[PDB]
Amino acid sequence: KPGAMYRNSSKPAYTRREYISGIPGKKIAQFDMGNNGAGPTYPAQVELVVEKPVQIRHNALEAARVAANRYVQNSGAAANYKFRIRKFPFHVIRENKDGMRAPFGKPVGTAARVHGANHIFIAWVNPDPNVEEAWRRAKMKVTPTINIDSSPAGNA
Amino acid sequence: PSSNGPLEGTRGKLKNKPRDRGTSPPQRAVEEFDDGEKVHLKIDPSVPNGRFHPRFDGQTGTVEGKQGDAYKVDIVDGGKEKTIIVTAAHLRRQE
C-alpha cells in the first residue's frame, strides 16, 4: 500500500489502545544504535530534520533507519558513534477493506506524526561525518524533504 | 448524541476539579434570597439534591418565591420563559 494513503495528518489522533484492538506490531527493531553504553560525549552532533508535518509509517521508519545505520557500517559493527531515532509510531491507521456502508476501516498499521522541523534522527560522531551520508540515504525513504543539520560542530 | 438522558454530555460541568472535591461549606447552602434578586445558576458537583437540569447551568434568573426550602427562579430559555426549582447550594448572588 502507498504512502499517499496515510501521509497526511488530516484525521483525529487515534492512539487509545484501550479502545482499539488488533494493532499490528511495529517493524522498528531498535531506536538506540551504536555505542548505547556511552552517553552523548561526542564532539559532532548532526540531525535529520523533517520539513513538513506528515505521518510516517513504521514501514518507512524501519527502512529509513536500517538504510542509515546499516550504512553507518563504514565505521564498523562496533564503531564509535551513537544513533537515535526519536519518534515512535503512535498513530494507529485503518483501511476500509459493503462499499462505503459501515466503512470505519480495520486497523492495518501505525505511523508517527512528525511536525515540520522536528528532528527524526540524531547521530553523534567524532570529526568523522559519514553520518551525513547515512542520512542522504535515510530521507530517501521517508515521505518529506529533509534538512541535514549539524549542531555541535564548527570543525568545518 | 447517542443517548438523551439528563446527564448526557455533562461530564465536565458535573465534575469537580480534584481540590474542590468533597462536601461543600454549608454557609452557601443556607444562603437566603429575596424575590427579585438576580442569581446565577450553577450546579455544585458535591451537592446531589436541590439540583436543576444541567442545561441551565450558566443562566442568571430572578428568584421569585420559593417552594419548600427550595427557591423558584424564573429564567428564559432561548425565547422561552421557565421557572426553575433550585436550592441555595446551587445559586449565587449576582454582582
Partner: protein, 186 residues
Amino acid sequence: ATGPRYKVPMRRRREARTDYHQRLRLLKSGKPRLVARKSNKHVRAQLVTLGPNGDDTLASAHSSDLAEYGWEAPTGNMPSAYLTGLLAGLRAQEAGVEEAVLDIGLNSPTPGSKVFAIQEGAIDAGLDIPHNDDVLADWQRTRGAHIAEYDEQLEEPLYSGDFDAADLPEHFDELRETLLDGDIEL
C-alpha cells in the same frame, strides 16, 4: 500536601472542631444556635446566629463569671452547667432572642449530660428550644445531689479546702433563685 490534586479538609475539620454535616442540619431551622461547650474546669454557652463573615454571638455565659453572682463552688459540674445555661438564656432574652436549637458540638447526646443541663437552663430562662424532657437529668442530679451523696462516703473531703466538707446543692438553689430576678448583666 502530596501534590496539586491532593484534597485538604477545611480548616475547622482539620482541627477536629466543627462537624460540618451536623452544622448544616442545625442551620436548617433558621433559628439561632445555643452553642453548648465544655472544658475540664469550665462550661460555656453561646447563642449564635449566622453572619456574612462568620457567626455572631448575641448572648453568652461562662461557668467562671458565675461566681460574680455568689458561686463559691467548682464550675465543671452539673449544677454549674445548668446555671450557665440559665444565665446565658436570660442575657439571651434580654438580647431580644426568643428561640434556638441546641448545637452540642462534638459532644455526645448522653442523657442527663451537662449539655442537656445547659439546655434545661436556657429553656427555664425563657428560651423556646426544641427538646425532650426524658433525656435531661432528674433535677436532683442537676442540683448536684449526686455529689453531696458522694461526699457522704467521705473519710476525706471531696473538695480540697474549697468551700464546705459535705457540699451544698442548697448553694445551687440560692443561686438559681438569685438569677430569676433583677441583678446586673441580666
